[PDB]
Automatic annotation (TrEMBL), chain B:
Domain Fructose-1-6-bisphosphatase class I N-terminal: 12-172
Protein name per the record: Sedoheptulose-1,7-bisphosphatase, chloroplastic
Catalytic activity: D-sedoheptulose 1,7-bisphosphate + H2O = D-sedoheptulose 7-phosphate + phosphate
Pathway(s) it belongs to: Carbohydrate biosynthesis; Calvin cycle
Residues represented out of the complete protein: 72 to 380 of 385
Organism: Chlamydomonas reinhardtii
Length: 311, 309
């Protein structure tokens, strides 16, 4: 119905945060075009960043660092690739991002995406996901979608990229309900984690539909769209954790809890927004989904849900 | 790095088949735009077909029937919905298509696709997949891809939709080599089929990566791209199969085997190209992948592989 800038002026009174969001949305539009026209002739999928030709996941990386530099509102930036923060010479926010999640399957024409979370202040460590003032993800499929949520504004919001190159609000999400769909990341952990094995058997026995592309952005965005489903990624003795709180799990946690979902993070049966992030490359495990399905996750994995079990 | 028309006039002498392939390619380009701009405001994902506004899978259905009629070379056509053939006054080939496989998840911005298979003559029943003269699938977003294989030409071929709106050959695929990802369709079947449970546990133990969207088009196209991977769909004794030989698995079988792979269809340990098609709406189970992985599928399911020892 209405544009992204019109949405931003009502959602937050901070013009710096509105500038930052417009920058990320522009970087997402450019990355989307970089992926659409990428040459995957060799072992890598490449495209151009100025005068040099790089892999699309490096094109996206340098595009996002550029957008952050010329936003003037970014103090620190950090990418999954080099998980060491770097000073952008602005001040106002610190942003951590996964520039092209699932870039290894761009050649398969699967959906891929960008993740970013926005913190205030100057630190990107000794913070928690809840301190995020905003988070967003770009989704690159047959349609280009900018999906954001801000700390002091309700709902998770979808902006569709239109033919005139402008972002238009298309859907607000406020509640995630019950349904039969599961995305079991780290399915191998059922070998030696019996609790996770019993939970996956529940999903199968109850005839939940399987949907797991491996790329996190569409595997989680499908919950916001359908207002149903569960995403699980679980550690085991022979299977160690590969998801990062800073670049992936915490930003998506805000996007999920806004729009009415919940999250269970680490092995701790708390929200990802409450997990302390001590190093930028910190790893973790996560479950997203409706409050009901997160309650079941914690009950199967840990015995009870301290937040959602009947008292 | 050459155009689709330049590809067609080489390694297929029939100009009628070249005309039909050009028509299909134009349909998938239109459908790719109808998906990109579709309005998913609510229960359905809609877009326009002329004066009326329909669901995108129905828009694609009318677009394909329209492209075949104006092709003048299509004697019979048949869609996944309304699985009864219709004539639309042509002569040359009979076509069967799934117009938008995975249309239920278009709103989730996953990759969706179209499938079509091309036969000669006038019948679309009492045929087999091997009689196909060509088959193809269109793969939608973030890139638009037209994937083809023809009977009188080697390999499976990929055409990318370029900025100028024209199709360009980007990859020929011959040979598929073992696997490191599996697409376990009908994963519930492991509950009462202990053979399928062992095979899936093999895939997991050997550290294959799970890669399964809802739709068949990207789930199988990832094998042609990576030259690796397995797709498995096994029937449970109680719940029937869902895949159709005419619209889905026999066209995909041509593409996979032309790409150097193999297929094990029905419960019969044979190629999907050799299964008799008695009714258009006929169901089936299938497993795609490399020769080594189809070997292992048949060896786990049935004991040994009659075709590959």
């Amino acid at each position: 119905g209405d544009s992204l800038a019109e949405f931003l002026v009502e959602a937050t009174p901070d013009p710096k945060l509105r500038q930052l969001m417009m920058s990320m949305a522009e970087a997402t539009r450019t990355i989307a075009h970089k992926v659409r026209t990428a040459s995957c002739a060799g072992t890598a999928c490449v495209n151009s960043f100025g005068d040099e030709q790089l892999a699309v996941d490096m094109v996206a990386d340098k595009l996002l660092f550029e957008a952050l530099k010329y936003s003037h509102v970014c103090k620190l930036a950090c990418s999954e690739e080099v998980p060491e923060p770097v000073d952008m010479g602005g001040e106002g926010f610190c942003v951590a991002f996964d520039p092209l999640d699932g870039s290894s399957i761009v050649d398969t024409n699967f959906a891929v995406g960008t993740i970013f979370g926005v913190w205030p202040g100057d630190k990107l460590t000794n913070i928690t996901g809840r301190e995020q003032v905003a988070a967003g993800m770009g989704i690159y499929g047959p349609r280009t979608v900018f999906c954001i949520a801000l700390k002091d504004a309700p709902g998770c919001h979808e902006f569709l990229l239109m033919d005139d190159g402008k972002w238009m609000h298309v859907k607000e999400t406020t509640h995630i309900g019950e349904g039969k769909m599961f995305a079991p990341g780290n399915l191998r952990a059922t070998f030696d984690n019996p609790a996770y094995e019993r939970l996956i058997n529940f999903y199968l026995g109850e005839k939940y539909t399987l949907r797991y592309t491996g790329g996190m952005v569409p595997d989680v965005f499908q919950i916001i769209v359908k207002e149903k489903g569960v995403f699980t990624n679980v550690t085991s003795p022979t299977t160690k954790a590969k998801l990062r709180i800073l670049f992936e799990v915490a930003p998506l946690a805000l996007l999920i809890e806004k729009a009415g979902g919940a999250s269970s993070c680490d092995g701790k049966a708390v929200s990802a927004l409450d997990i302390p992030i001590l190093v930028c490359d910190q790893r973790t495990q996560i479950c997203y989904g409706s409050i009901g399905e997160v309650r079941r996750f914690e009950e199967y994995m840990y015995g009870t849900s301290p937040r959602f079990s009947e008292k």
